[PDB]
């Protein structure tokens, strides 16, 4: 039996050397071309344990995306541990591309194909793949964007549902498009639009899955963030190199008992960093229309915990959960 093991996976992508967009530039030096001859082999009569919450693939991806951002998006001023650094801070072209992670000789990536798979415990439909599927390294809070959908029903996953401190990762089975724009010609005012009925239906179906986990006698409530850094109180993300902070109150105020939801957003120059504890200042926004149309494919939630009612709030912050939301079906083993 092949044992789980750590190695440096290599990355593969469709990056182009003639594209100045920063993910492309990073991948042109860090990665190889996307596998021209992918091969998935089913492992007959094999049952394998997985644990999405303890997976070194996540840690490697995290370090890679930190490196990508550090090389690519330079702040004008950075404050870490009382120390200030200043440097040139040019605007860049920024649009994530899919990255695949690949096993080098002596190692294999195992993939769980079980339909209901919660990320931990035994998998009965296991295959080997030369590389993962292509994952866009989207850095965001609250909502997971441009990811992969659950094939059948919505799936919710947690390291321990009974522990209210553990994040719940929701995987949708139907994308909800969200369009965010800072219009052409207040240069920091922006907004996001999404279908009201689609979002309401989404919340209803998530609530059903939550009741299935916590008790059908339970009443499910969504409420906004309880507070903290603006990055986690809002739905925050990077669009076109600019940092958007979108008020998500309307998304997360719901109970069981207009065509579009319009979320107000602000582009901020001073951000709390996700890569390390500290703050960074970037330059004011570029001119012109700044717009991103994204698929909402998942959510990060916390549950209040602590009678008869369960309250859930938008969460996130630790980007390792973003990577886990795509890497949950994979593990690396040593061939012996």
């Amino acid at each position: 039996v092949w044992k789980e093991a750590t190695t440096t996976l290599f990355c593969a992508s469709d990056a182009k050397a003639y594209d100045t967009e920063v993910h492309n530039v990073w991948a042109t030096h860090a990665c190889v071309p996307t596998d021209p001859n992918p091969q998935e082999v089913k492992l007959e009569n094999v049952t394998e344990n997985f644990n999405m919450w303890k997976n070194n693939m996540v840690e490697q991806m995290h370090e890679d995306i930190i490196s990508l951002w550090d090389q690519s998006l330079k702040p004008c001023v950075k404050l870490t541990g009382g120390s200030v650094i200043t440097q040139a801070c040019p605007k860049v072209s920024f649009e994530p591309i899919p990255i695949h992670y690949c096993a080098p000789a002596g190692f294999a990536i195992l993939k769980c194909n079980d339909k209901k798979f919660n990320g931990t415990g035994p998998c009965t439909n296991v295959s080997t793949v030369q590389c993962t599927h292509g994952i866009r390294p989207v850095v965001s809070t609250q909502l997971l964007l441009n990811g992969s959908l659950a094939e059948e029903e919505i799936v919710i996953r947690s390291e321990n549902f009974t522990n209210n401190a553990k994040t719940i990762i929701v995987q949708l089975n139907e994308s909800v498009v969200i369009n965010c724009t800072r219009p052409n010609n207040d240069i920091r005012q922006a907004h996001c639009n999404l279908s009201k009925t689609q979002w309401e239906n989404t919340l209803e179906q998530i609530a059903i899955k939550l009741k299935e986990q916590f008790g059908n006698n339970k009443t499910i409530i969504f409420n906004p963030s309880s507070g903290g850094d603006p990055e986690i109180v809002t739905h925050s993300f990077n669009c076109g190199g600019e940092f958007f902070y979108c008020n998500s109150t309307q998304l997360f105020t719901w109970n069981d008992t207009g065509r579009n939801i319009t979320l107000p957003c602000r582009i901020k120059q001073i951000i709390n960093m996700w890569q390390e504890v500290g703050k960074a200042m970037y330059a004011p926004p570029i001119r012109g229309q700044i717009r991103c149309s994204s698929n909402i494919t998942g959510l990060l939630l916390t549950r209040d915990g602590g009678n008869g009612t369960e309250i859930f709030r938008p969460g996130g912050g630790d980007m390792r959960d973003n990577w886990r939301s795509e890497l949950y079906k994979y593990k690396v083993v040593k061939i012996e």
């Binding site: 850094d229 709390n272 504890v277």
Partner: peptide, 27 residues
């Protein structure tokens, strides 16, 4: 994350603080 200052901030909303990665979250 700065946990102490995170804690120092959240209590003023009536709340405990904890890290969410490199971010401060109130509970």
């Amino acid at each position: 994350x700065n946990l102490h200052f995170c804690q120092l901030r959240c209590k003023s909303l009536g709340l405990l603080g904890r890290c969410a990665x490199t971010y401060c979250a109130c509970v």
